[PDB]
mmCIF file of all heavy atoms in Angstrom:
data_model
loop_
_atom_site.group_PDB
_atom_site.id
_atom_site.type_symbol
_atom_site.label_atom_id
_atom_site.label_comp_id
_atom_site.label_asym_id
_atom_site.label_seq_id
_atom_site.Cartn_x
_atom_site.Cartn_y
_atom_site.Cartn_z
ATOM 1 N N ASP A 1 273.685 75.741 73.608
ATOM 2 C CA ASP A 1 274.448 75.030 74.604
ATOM 3 C C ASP A 1 275.928 75.568 74.641
ATOM 4 O O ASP A 1 276.531 75.598 73.584
ATOM 5 C CB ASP A 1 274.341 73.597 74.440
ATOM 6 C CG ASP A 1 272.916 73.030 74.516
ATOM 7 O OD1 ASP A 1 272.294 73.191 75.646
ATOM 8 O OD2 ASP A 1 272.421 72.414 73.521
ATOM 9 N N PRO A 2 276.489 75.774 75.940
ATOM 10 C CA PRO A 2 277.839 76.268 75.944
ATOM 11 C C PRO A 2 278.890 75.328 75.436
ATOM 12 O O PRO A 2 278.764 74.068 75.428
ATOM 13 C CB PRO A 2 277.993 76.572 77.424
ATOM 14 C CG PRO A 2 276.689 76.723 78.022
ATOM 15 C CD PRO A 2 275.791 75.873 77.191
ATOM 16 N N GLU A 3 279.953 75.878 74.856
ATOM 17 C CA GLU A 3 281.017 75.061 74.229
ATOM 18 C C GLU A 3 281.735 74.158 75.178
ATOM 19 O O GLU A 3 282.038 73.032 74.816
ATOM 20 C CB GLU A 3 282.070 75.972 73.491
ATOM 21 C CG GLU A 3 281.458 76.744 72.235
ATOM 22 C CD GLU A 3 280.518 77.984 72.614
ATOM 23 O OE1 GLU A 3 280.630 78.417 73.753
ATOM 24 O OE2 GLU A 3 279.864 78.424 71.742
ATOM 25 N N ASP A 4 281.931 74.521 76.469
ATOM 26 C CA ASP A 4 282.527 73.728 77.528
ATOM 27 C C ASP A 4 281.582 72.482 77.733
ATOM 28 O O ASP A 4 281.982 71.428 77.730
ATOM 29 C CB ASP A 4 282.718 74.513 78.712
ATOM 30 C CG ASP A 4 283.316 73.777 79.897
ATOM 31 O OD1 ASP A 4 284.220 72.874 79.646
ATOM 32 O OD2 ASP A 4 282.975 73.942 81.041
ATOM 33 N N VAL A 5 280.231 72.765 77.813
ATOM 34 C CA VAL A 5 279.330 71.647 78.033
ATOM 35 C C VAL A 5 279.275 70.692 76.888
ATOM 36 O O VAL A 5 279.234 69.426 77.228
ATOM 37 C CB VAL A 5 277.865 72.288 78.256
ATOM 38 C CG1 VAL A 5 276.822 71.195 78.330
ATOM 39 C CG2 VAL A 5 277.814 73.155 79.560
ATOM 40 N N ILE A 6 279.219 71.036 75.671
ATOM 41 C CA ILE A 6 279.255 70.090 74.522
ATOM 42 C C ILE A 6 280.548 69.305 74.483
ATOM 43 O O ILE A 6 280.564 68.099 74.200
ATOM 44 C CB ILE A 6 278.861 70.865 73.240
ATOM 45 C CG1 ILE A 6 278.559 69.776 72.129
ATOM 46 C CG2 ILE A 6 279.927 71.865 72.786
ATOM 47 C CD1 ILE A 6 277.211 69.221 72.305
ATOM 48 N N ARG A 7 281.688 70.029 74.699
ATOM 49 C CA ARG A 7 283.028 69.270 74.678
ATOM 50 C C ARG A 7 282.954 68.316 75.787
ATOM 51 O O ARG A 7 283.467 67.113 75.531
ATOM 52 C CB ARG A 7 284.136 70.291 74.922
ATOM 53 C CG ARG A 7 284.389 71.213 73.785
ATOM 54 C CD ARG A 7 285.290 72.292 74.206
ATOM 55 N NE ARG A 7 285.304 73.513 73.393
ATOM 56 C CZ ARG A 7 285.419 74.809 73.763
ATOM 57 N NH1 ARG A 7 285.644 75.012 75.064
ATOM 58 N NH2 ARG A 7 285.413 75.767 72.912
ATOM 59 N N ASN A 8 282.564 68.509 77.002
ATOM 60 C CA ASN A 8 282.678 67.629 78.109
ATOM 61 C C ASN A 8 281.558 66.470 77.895
ATOM 62 O O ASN A 8 281.900 65.329 78.284
ATOM 63 C CB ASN A 8 282.435 68.428 79.410
ATOM 64 C CG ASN A 8 283.590 69.410 79.723
ATOM 65 O OD1 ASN A 8 284.629 69.284 79.194
ATOM 66 N ND2 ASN A 8 283.305 70.442 80.491
ATOM 67 N N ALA A 9 280.414 66.830 77.416
ATOM 68 C CA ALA A 9 279.500 65.800 77.017
ATOM 69 C C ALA A 9 280.061 64.857 75.957
ATOM 70 O O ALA A 9 279.889 63.598 76.168
ATOM 71 C CB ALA A 9 278.213 66.406 76.564
ATOM 72 N N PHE A 10 280.677 65.359 75.020
ATOM 73 C CA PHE A 10 281.285 64.466 74.015
ATOM 74 C C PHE A 10 282.389 63.667 74.491
ATOM 75 O O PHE A 10 282.599 62.471 74.179
ATOM 76 C CB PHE A 10 281.775 65.344 72.759
ATOM 77 C CG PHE A 10 280.672 65.692 71.810
ATOM 78 C CD1 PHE A 10 279.399 65.931 72.226
ATOM 79 C CD2 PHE A 10 280.891 65.798 70.449
ATOM 80 C CE1 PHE A 10 278.337 66.300 71.379
ATOM 81 C CE2 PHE A 10 279.936 66.177 69.557
ATOM 82 C CZ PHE A 10 278.738 66.421 70.004
ATOM 83 N N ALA A 11 283.266 64.207 75.468
ATOM 84 C CA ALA A 11 284.328 63.433 76.164
ATOM 85 C C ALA A 11 283.685 62.350 76.979
ATOM 86 O O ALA A 11 284.228 61.236 76.980
ATOM 87 C CB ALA A 11 285.154 64.367 76.982
ATOM 88 N N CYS A 12 282.576 62.632 77.628
ATOM 89 C CA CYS A 12 282.014 61.490 78.451
ATOM 90 C C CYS A 12 281.319 60.485 77.527
ATOM 91 O O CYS A 12 281.330 59.230 77.770
ATOM 92 C CB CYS A 12 280.879 62.048 79.378
ATOM 93 S SG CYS A 12 281.543 63.125 80.676
ATOM 94 N N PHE A 13 280.790 60.902 76.334
ATOM 95 C CA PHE A 13 280.140 59.976 75.440
ATOM 96 C C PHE A 13 281.153 59.098 74.816
ATOM 97 O O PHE A 13 280.992 57.800 74.666
ATOM 98 C CB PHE A 13 279.376 60.718 74.321
ATOM 99 C CG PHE A 13 278.943 59.881 73.127
ATOM 100 C CD1 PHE A 13 277.791 59.195 73.168
ATOM 101 C CD2 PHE A 13 279.792 59.759 72.065
ATOM 102 C CE1 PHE A 13 277.351 58.369 72.057
ATOM 103 C CE2 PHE A 13 279.356 58.955 70.949
ATOM 104 C CZ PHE A 13 278.231 58.229 71.076
ATOM 105 N N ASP A 14 282.390 59.642 74.421
ATOM 106 C CA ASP A 14 283.365 58.860 73.774
ATOM 107 C C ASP A 14 283.897 57.636 74.557
ATOM 108 O O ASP A 14 284.187 57.784 75.732
ATOM 109 C CB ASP A 14 284.554 59.800 73.357
ATOM 110 C CG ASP A 14 285.619 59.074 72.614
ATOM 111 O OD1 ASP A 14 285.427 57.958 72.007
ATOM 112 O OD2 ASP A 14 286.780 59.721 72.651
ATOM 113 N N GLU A 15 283.980 56.556 73.828
ATOM 114 C CA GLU A 15 284.514 55.292 74.511
ATOM 115 C C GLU A 15 286.076 55.450 74.756
ATOM 116 O O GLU A 15 286.602 54.799 75.673
ATOM 117 C CB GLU A 15 284.294 54.116 73.650
ATOM 118 C CG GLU A 15 282.856 53.437 73.944
ATOM 119 C CD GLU A 15 281.684 54.122 73.252
ATOM 120 O OE1 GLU A 15 282.024 54.704 72.042
ATOM 121 O OE2 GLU A 15 280.725 54.273 73.850
ATOM 122 N N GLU A 16 286.807 56.348 73.956
ATOM 123 C CA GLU A 16 288.209 56.595 74.284
ATOM 124 C C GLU A 16 288.227 57.645 75.380
ATOM 125 O O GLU A 16 289.308 58.091 75.778
ATOM 126 C CB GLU A 16 288.936 57.151 72.965
ATOM 127 C CG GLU A 16 290.494 57.103 73.055
ATOM 128 C CD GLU A 16 291.117 57.225 71.730
ATOM 129 O OE1 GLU A 16 290.542 58.027 70.851
ATOM 130 O OE2 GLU A 16 292.238 56.671 71.514
ATOM 131 N N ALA A 17 287.163 58.091 75.937
ATOM 132 C CA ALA A 17 287.043 59.047 76.978
ATOM 133 C C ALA A 17 287.623 60.476 76.753
ATOM 134 O O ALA A 17 287.920 61.213 77.697
ATOM 135 C CB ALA A 17 287.452 58.508 78.394
ATOM 136 N N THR A 18 287.926 60.653 75.483
ATOM 137 C CA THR A 18 288.810 61.718 75.107
ATOM 138 C C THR A 18 288.085 62.704 74.157
ATOM 139 O O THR A 18 288.645 63.824 73.939
ATOM 140 C CB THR A 18 290.056 61.107 74.345
ATOM 141 O OG1 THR A 18 290.790 60.395 75.362
ATOM 142 C CG2 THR A 18 291.046 62.124 73.794
ATOM 143 N N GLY A 19 286.927 62.328 73.530
ATOM 144 C CA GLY A 19 286.201 63.250 72.693
ATOM 145 C C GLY A 19 286.493 62.991 71.185
ATOM 146 O O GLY A 19 286.127 63.824 70.396
ATOM 147 N N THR A 20 287.122 61.875 70.800
ATOM 148 C CA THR A 20 287.389 61.501 69.474
ATOM 149 C C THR A 20 286.258 60.814 68.857
ATOM 150 O O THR A 20 285.366 60.184 69.596
ATOM 151 C CB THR A 20 288.711 60.657 69.330
ATOM 152 O OG1 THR A 20 288.431 59.347 69.692
ATOM 153 C CG2 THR A 20 289.764 61.231 70.324
ATOM 154 N N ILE A 21 286.150 60.671 67.503
ATOM 155 C CA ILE A 21 285.067 59.997 66.877
ATOM 156 C C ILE A 21 285.467 59.569 65.432
ATOM 157 O O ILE A 21 286.249 60.341 64.748
ATOM 158 C CB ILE A 21 283.781 60.763 66.885
ATOM 159 C CG1 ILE A 21 282.584 59.886 66.635
ATOM 160 C CG2 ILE A 21 283.797 61.970 65.887
ATOM 161 C CD1 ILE A 21 282.315 58.948 67.792
ATOM 162 N N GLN A 22 285.059 58.431 65.015
ATOM 163 C CA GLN A 22 285.371 57.946 63.642
ATOM 164 C C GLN A 22 284.190 58.384 62.696
ATOM 165 O O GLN A 22 283.082 58.680 63.211
ATOM 166 C CB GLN A 22 285.362 56.378 63.645
ATOM 167 C CG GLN A 22 286.563 55.834 64.274
ATOM 168 C CD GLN A 22 286.608 55.839 65.895
ATOM 169 O OE1 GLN A 22 285.496 55.948 66.446
ATOM 170 N NE2 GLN A 22 287.706 55.756 66.606
ATOM 171 N N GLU A 23 284.464 58.520 61.393
ATOM 172 C CA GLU A 23 283.584 59.141 60.452
ATOM 173 C C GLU A 23 282.228 58.417 60.328
ATOM 174 O O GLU A 23 281.150 59.041 60.418
ATOM 175 C CB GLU A 23 284.290 59.124 59.098
ATOM 176 C CG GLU A 23 283.379 59.738 57.913
ATOM 177 C CD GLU A 23 284.110 59.654 56.521
ATOM 178 O OE1 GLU A 23 285.313 59.275 56.533
ATOM 179 O OE2 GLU A 23 283.477 60.025 55.489
ATOM 180 N N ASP A 24 282.254 57.081 60.162
ATOM 181 C CA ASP A 24 280.970 56.336 60.058
ATOM 182 C C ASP A 24 280.291 56.202 61.337
ATOM 183 O O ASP A 24 278.986 56.334 61.368
ATOM 184 C CB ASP A 24 281.380 54.977 59.489
ATOM 185 C CG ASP A 24 282.489 54.253 60.184
ATOM 186 O OD1 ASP A 24 283.036 54.704 61.181
ATOM 187 O OD2 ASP A 24 282.810 53.069 59.764
ATOM 188 N N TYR A 25 280.980 56.132 62.484
ATOM 189 C CA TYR A 25 280.333 56.193 63.883
ATOM 190 C C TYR A 25 279.683 57.421 64.038
ATOM 191 O O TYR A 25 278.496 57.419 64.456
ATOM 192 C CB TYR A 25 281.445 55.816 64.873
ATOM 193 C CG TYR A 25 281.080 55.575 66.302
ATOM 194 C CD1 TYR A 25 279.702 55.229 66.650
ATOM 195 C CD2 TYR A 25 281.909 55.603 67.310
ATOM 196 C CE1 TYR A 25 279.432 55.000 67.965
ATOM 197 C CE2 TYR A 25 281.599 55.334 68.691
ATOM 198 C CZ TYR A 25 280.250 55.026 68.958
ATOM 199 O OH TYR A 25 279.924 54.842 70.284
ATOM 200 N N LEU A 26 280.330 58.538 63.780
ATOM 201 C CA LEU A 26 279.600 59.904 63.936
ATOM 202 C C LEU A 26 278.432 59.943 62.996
ATOM 203 O O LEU A 26 277.376 60.523 63.468
ATOM 204 C CB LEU A 26 280.707 60.973 63.594
ATOM 205 C CG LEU A 26 280.233 62.432 63.646
ATOM 206 C CD1 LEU A 26 279.661 62.767 64.972
ATOM 207 C CD2 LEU A 26 281.307 63.382 63.264
ATOM 208 N N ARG A 27 278.522 59.576 61.804
ATOM 209 C CA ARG A 27 277.508 59.613 60.836
ATOM 210 C C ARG A 27 276.243 58.899 61.324
ATOM 211 O O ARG A 27 275.083 59.482 61.296
ATOM 212 C CB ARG A 27 277.873 59.009 59.501
ATOM 213 C CG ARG A 27 276.893 58.989 58.390
ATOM 214 C CD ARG A 27 276.352 60.385 58.042
ATOM 215 N NE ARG A 27 277.305 61.201 57.266
ATOM 216 C CZ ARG A 27 277.128 61.476 56.038
ATOM 217 N NH1 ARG A 27 276.094 60.947 55.295
ATOM 218 N NH2 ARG A 27 277.910 62.430 55.473
ATOM 219 N N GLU A 28 276.467 57.640 61.783
ATOM 220 C CA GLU A 28 275.319 56.958 62.398
ATOM 221 C C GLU A 28 274.686 57.663 63.580
ATOM 222 O O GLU A 28 273.535 57.928 63.669
ATOM 223 C CB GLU A 28 275.790 55.457 62.726
ATOM 224 C CG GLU A 28 276.107 54.569 61.512
ATOM 225 C CD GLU A 28 274.867 54.394 60.604
ATOM 226 O OE1 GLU A 28 274.570 55.285 59.821
ATOM 227 O OE2 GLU A 28 274.322 53.260 60.688
ATOM 228 N N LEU A 29 275.662 58.016 64.538
ATOM 229 C CA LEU A 29 275.084 58.610 65.793
ATOM 230 C C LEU A 29 274.288 59.837 65.533
ATOM 231 O O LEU A 29 273.290 60.056 66.185
ATOM 232 C CB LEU A 29 276.357 59.006 66.704
ATOM 233 C CG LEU A 29 277.087 57.781 67.225
ATOM 234 C CD1 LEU A 29 278.449 58.309 67.660
ATOM 235 C CD2 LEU A 29 276.291 57.167 68.401
ATOM 236 N N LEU A 30 274.739 60.747 64.672
ATOM 237 C CA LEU A 30 273.972 61.846 64.261
ATOM 238 C C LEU A 30 272.592 61.501 63.573
ATOM 239 O O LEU A 30 271.526 62.046 64.034
ATOM 240 C CB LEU A 30 274.753 62.813 63.363
ATOM 241 C CG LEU A 30 275.935 63.483 63.968
ATOM 242 C CD1 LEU A 30 276.908 63.997 62.860
ATOM 243 C CD2 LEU A 30 275.537 64.629 64.841
ATOM 244 N N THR A 31 272.677 60.544 62.659
ATOM 245 C CA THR A 31 271.447 60.199 61.843
ATOM 246 C C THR A 31 270.424 59.277 62.658
ATOM 247 O O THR A 31 269.178 59.369 62.315
ATOM 248 C CB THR A 31 271.834 59.581 60.594
ATOM 249 O OG1 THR A 31 272.728 58.422 60.858
ATOM 250 C CG2 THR A 31 272.484 60.500 59.630
ATOM 251 N N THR A 32 270.829 58.389 63.538
ATOM 252 C CA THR A 32 270.112 57.112 63.768
ATOM 253 C C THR A 32 269.157 57.138 64.968
ATOM 254 O O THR A 32 269.318 58.000 65.851
ATOM 255 C CB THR A 32 271.102 55.983 63.931
ATOM 256 O OG1 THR A 32 271.979 55.992 62.794
ATOM 257 C CG2 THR A 32 270.460 54.637 63.902
ATOM 258 N N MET A 33 268.102 56.381 64.889
ATOM 259 C CA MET A 33 267.025 56.332 65.860
ATOM 260 C C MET A 33 266.289 57.647 65.976
ATOM 261 O O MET A 33 266.292 58.243 67.066
ATOM 262 C CB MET A 33 267.508 55.790 67.200
ATOM 263 C CG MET A 33 268.307 54.438 67.199
ATOM 264 S SD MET A 33 267.587 53.142 66.122
ATOM 265 C CE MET A 33 266.078 52.751 66.980
ATOM 266 N N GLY A 34 265.533 58.064 64.978
ATOM 267 C CA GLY A 34 264.711 59.140 64.989
ATOM 268 C C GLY A 34 265.345 60.520 64.899
ATOM 269 O O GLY A 34 264.634 61.576 64.699
ATOM 270 N N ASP A 35 266.657 60.656 65.171
ATOM 271 C CA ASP A 35 267.374 61.883 64.975
ATOM 272 C C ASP A 35 267.115 62.344 63.399
ATOM 273 O O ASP A 35 267.304 61.454 62.544
ATOM 274 C CB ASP A 35 268.855 61.675 65.278
ATOM 275 C CG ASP A 35 269.158 61.649 66.780
ATOM 276 O OD1 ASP A 35 268.494 62.330 67.429
ATOM 277 O OD2 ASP A 35 269.926 60.794 67.196
ATOM 278 N N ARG A 36 266.862 63.566 63.252
ATOM 279 C CA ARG A 36 266.358 64.111 61.925
ATOM 280 C C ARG A 36 267.435 64.349 60.917
ATOM 281 O O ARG A 36 267.168 64.863 59.817
ATOM 282 C CB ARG A 36 265.527 65.254 62.133
ATOM 283 C CG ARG A 36 266.270 66.548 62.683
ATOM 284 C CD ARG A 36 265.666 67.798 62.089
ATOM 285 N NE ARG A 36 265.817 67.948 60.681
ATOM 286 C CZ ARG A 36 266.924 68.365 60.123
ATOM 287 N NH1 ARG A 36 268.026 68.772 60.757
ATOM 288 N NH2 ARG A 36 266.965 68.309 58.771
#
């Protein structure tokens, strides 16, 4: 997936609308609900 696409997706995902993320929040998001 292109780097522009993943940056803009992460910016839309982030509640700060900026693409930032906290360590534990990121850890859960990557791991949780069937993500491997």
